[PDB]
Amino acid sequence: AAAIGIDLGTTYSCVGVFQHGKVEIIANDQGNRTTPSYVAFTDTERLIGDAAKNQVALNPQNSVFDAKRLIGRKFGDPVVQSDMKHWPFQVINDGDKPKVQVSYKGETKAFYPEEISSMVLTKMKEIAEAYLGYPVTNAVITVPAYFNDSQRQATKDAGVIAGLNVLRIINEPTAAAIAYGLDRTGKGERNVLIFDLGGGTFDVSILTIDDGIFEVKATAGDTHLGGEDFDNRLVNHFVEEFKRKHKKDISQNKRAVRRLRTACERAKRTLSSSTQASLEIDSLFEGIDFYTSITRARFEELCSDLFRSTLEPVEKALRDAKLDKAQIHDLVLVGGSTRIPKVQKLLQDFFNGRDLNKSINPDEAVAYGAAVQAAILM
Ligand SMILES: Nc1ncnc2c1ncn2[C@@H]1O[C@H](COP(=O)(O)OP(=O)(O)O)[C@@H](O)[C@H]1O
Ligand SMILES: [K+]
């Protein structure tokens, strides 16, 4: 029985398996090759993934996401205190450890972040088993390069809770380099830059690989810049358009905003391959249909400051690594948001036109490398 590779992501997770000699990234039951790291507790069931993220509930307190932001941290951590101010669910203190408290089937329940993450890993395990047709018990799970020992142990604990034997925890940028075979270099140092713009975080890592051995030389980024922020700019744009056209403010109706956010995320993705996207929602607010569109150009304008801001951490990483651009041998794209053409253009221009590694979908590259590593260790 195969071991799998799992990218347990801040916003989206992905699972792959090495078989027939290569990695197959596995689609979930809605046919999506990544799954939101998102749980919802309802009157009658626990929803995980797409069903949780797109649920349109009257009571927003009972969904949980961003557990990776809490994992391995103490309640009084200023990052925890800061993040709590923008989550709809309740974080409580139990012996200086944060727990999330929700109502499920009418009863109050609290969960440690490792337990929430275990539910996401359980879903990914189940996606893999549905595809393989047999049970899976072994996995490699990835984490950010900047995770410390406590965060790594907590991620392994989430794996154990989910019923997995965790063969190894590897760094996300290392996983991406392995996906592209950059581990097979030979004697002599090879410097790899990983540009990872995801749904919630932006990370730039510089790795040196020497005779198969990886060393992280520098990391930089922004833990609050990602695709969700671009979604938010689109949602705000369309809320303004609705008010302009229909003289009604929908922004305080949680159900309308949720439906709009789901439609906006789809439209954003479409703008990565097409030059315009339709946005069509029946009965969005007070019975009023909302049919409209947006061009790729307009989306780029809405997000221009955020896209440009990704270049400073690249300069920082290079400075910390004491490397010139020409000393970087391979550039690798990771993260769903690096599928945005404007983002690729900015990075390519910064690197004087050089080729970017992007043939593996960037939102899948981490799971791909994790799956290669899982096959190696089994
Ligand atoms: N084709 C696409 N174009 C633009 N953004 C995309 C595309 N596909 C996924 N995304 C965005 O990628 C982000 C998720 O990135 P991903 O790397 O899958 O997760 P994480 O950052 O949680 O590891 C989401 O904001 C999603 O909307
Ligand atoms: K991911």
Ligand SMILES: [Mg+2]
């Ligand atoms: Mg990621």
